[PDB]
Ligand binder design. Structure first.
Ligand SMILES: [Mg+2]
Ligand SMILES: [Mg+2]
Ligand SMILES: [Mg+2]
Ligand SMILES: [Zn+2]
Lengths: 93, 95, 147, 200
RNA sequence: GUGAAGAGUUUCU
């Protein structure tokens, strides 16, 4: 849905424990490090013979992910995360 | 050495004394006879091909390239730095 | 012994107590504890909550000897000393105060539960809690730290 | 003496001198039999430090062993089992090629005892080794207290039981935390034997 | 492995 690019909300950060103005952005997953222990373990497991050693998702649906709002306090650099209901369309401002 | 179980110099305080020489710990020292033999062998045998390549990079002042090549050839960086210093002494020995 | 076992009582009872309908088949819900997340969930979640999943840090090559530190409370301190030492000092006025070396009784830290009698005592320990030290000092005694 | 010079020069396998000698000797070795007798050690300093002595009863044999892994010898790559066991190609023998060299020379000289072995050369196809052997029936061996031990029957085919230097390496015989799996079967038995005491 | 030309202290045809 339409969501303002700025919102004034309670700031949980230790230096601003009050309502302040925040810049709003949509959360996006980061890019999957190769050094994470689970990836190191999976790669070690997958080596050698035996084929695929763990489940792999062959399907996909429910492309309505819950929208996560990243709220950055303008001056404090403090960032907060807010969860909204699912929707097919998103637009900031 | 407070005599506690925490802190920098922890532990019970006893009368410290000098431990005797263990000749096994002499290993790694350079005997004069072995140094003489190695200088003769270095005269008879030349340099390995990678050693020549590293020395060339040293002579062209490509210090990072020499370090990357020596580490790549020998494995570890620690062995590379020792080798580059040894080959640097050779280069300056000829100068 | 076998003579008093329930098996002896079931001789002549055809199903040996296992029912005519449901019987005593081989493993009808699987072997061991398999299925805690699926068909055994109502048991695992009721009687063993916390079973599945990970919590906390790993520690590679744990060696427990450097962590050894059994504890004794203040109310047991005077019990560590022989009966003759108790009679000589406990409740008396003496120039010397008894030494209670808690480490030779098998303890690494003195904790503060309980109370002490009002006689001076020297407590030799590797560690001591703050409240344990305050109560030792109120009784006129001291804590001396050792290794 | 000369032995120190030979030891230091043997370390320079990339030098012009050793590269040339390696090329000619590898060519010469490929011309004779897979297993053949050596009149003398090609590396006298290496042979001495591995137990060899220049006396009657000590024998040097040379052998070349095919390099590379162990292809699974199953009929058409067919393993008849689970996918974890379907591998055929990139597999490896648990014993070193030096161990195989000792095994084959020991069979070839069944009257002798394998003492030790050392590398001498390699090309893309073969590794070349020299195997040191001792005659336990020779009087010069049997009266010598420094090599006498090998006459006793407990040392029969020590190479086949992994008892040479390279055999113990391939068995993972060592001290300390890195070799906890130790002699494997004996260690495994100790951990998988249920000990049921007379509780009285 | 050993030799010859060519290419903007080197290795490519
Ligand atoms: Mg029935
Ligand atoms: Mg039924
Ligand atoms: Mg032995
Ligand atoms: Zn703020």
């Amino acid at each position: 849905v339409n969501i303002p690019k700025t919102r004034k909300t309670y700031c949980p950060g230790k230096n601003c424990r009050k309502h302040t103005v925040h810049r709003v952005t949509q959360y996006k997953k980061g890019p999957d490090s190769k050094l994470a222990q689970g990836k190191r373990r999976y790669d070690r497991k997958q080596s050698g013979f035996g084929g695929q050693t763990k489940p792999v998702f062959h399907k996909k649906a429910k492309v309505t992910k819950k929208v996560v709002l990243r709220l950055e306090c303008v001056s404090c650099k403090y960032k907060n995360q807010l969860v909204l209901k699912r929707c097919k369309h998103f637009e900031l401002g | 050495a407070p005599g506690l179980v925490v802190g920098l110099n922890k532990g019970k305080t006893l009368t410290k004394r000098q431990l005797p020489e263990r000749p096994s710990r002499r290993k790694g020292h350079l005997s004069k006879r072995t140094a003489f033999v190695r200088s003769i062998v270095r005269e008879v045998a030349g340099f390995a091909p990678y050693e020549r390549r590293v020395m060339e990079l040293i002579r062209n002042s490509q210090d990072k390239r020499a370090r990357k090549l020596a580490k790549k050839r020998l494995g570890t960086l620690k062995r590379a730095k020792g080798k580059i210093e040894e080959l640097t002494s050779v280069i300056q020995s000829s100068r | 012994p076998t003579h008093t076992s329930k098996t002896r009582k079931l001789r002549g009872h055809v199903s040996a107590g296992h029912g005519r309908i449901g019987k005593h088949r081989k493993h009808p819900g699987g072997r061991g504890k398999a299925g805690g997340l699926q068909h055994l969930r109502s048991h695992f979640d009721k009687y063993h909550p916390g079973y599945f999943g990970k919590v906390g840090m790993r520690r590679f090559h744990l060696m427990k000897n450097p962590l050894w530190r059994p504890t004794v409370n203040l109310d047991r301190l005077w019990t560590l000393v022989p009966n003759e030492t108790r009679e000589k000092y406990l409740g008396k006025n003496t120039e010397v105060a008894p030494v209670i070396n808690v480490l030779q009784s098998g303890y690494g830290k003195v904790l503060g539960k309980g109370r002490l009698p009002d006689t001076p005592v020297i407590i030799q320990t590797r560690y001591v809690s703050r409240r344990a030290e305050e109560k030792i000092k109120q009784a006129g005694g001291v804590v001396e730290l050792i290794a | 003496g000369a032995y120190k010079y030979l030891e230091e020069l043997a370390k320079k396998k990339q030098s012009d001198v050793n590269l040339f000698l390696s090329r000619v000797r590898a060519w010469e070795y490929r011309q004779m039999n897979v297993i053949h007798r050596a009149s003398r050690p090609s590396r006298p300093d290496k042979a001495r430090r591995l137990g060899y002595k220049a006396k009657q009863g000590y024998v040097i044999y040379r052998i070349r062993v095919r390099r590379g892994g162990r292809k699974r010898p199953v009929p058409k790559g067919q393993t008849y089992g689970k996918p974890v066991h379907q591998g055929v190609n990139h597999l490896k023998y648990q014993r070193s090629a030096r161990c195989t060299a000792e095994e084959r020379v020991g069979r070839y000289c069944s009257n002798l005892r394998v003492l030790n072995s050392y590398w001498v050369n390699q090309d893309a196809t073969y590794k070349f080794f020299e195997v040191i052997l001792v005659d336990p029936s020779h009087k010069a061996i049997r009266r010598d207290p420094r090599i006498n031990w090998i006459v006793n029957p407990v040392h029969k085919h020590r190479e086949s039981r992994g008892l040479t230097s390279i055999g113990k390496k391939s068995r993972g015989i060592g001290k300390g935390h890195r070799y906890n799996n130790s002699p494997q079967h004996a260690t495994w038995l100790r951990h998988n034997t249920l000990s049921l005491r007379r509780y009285r």
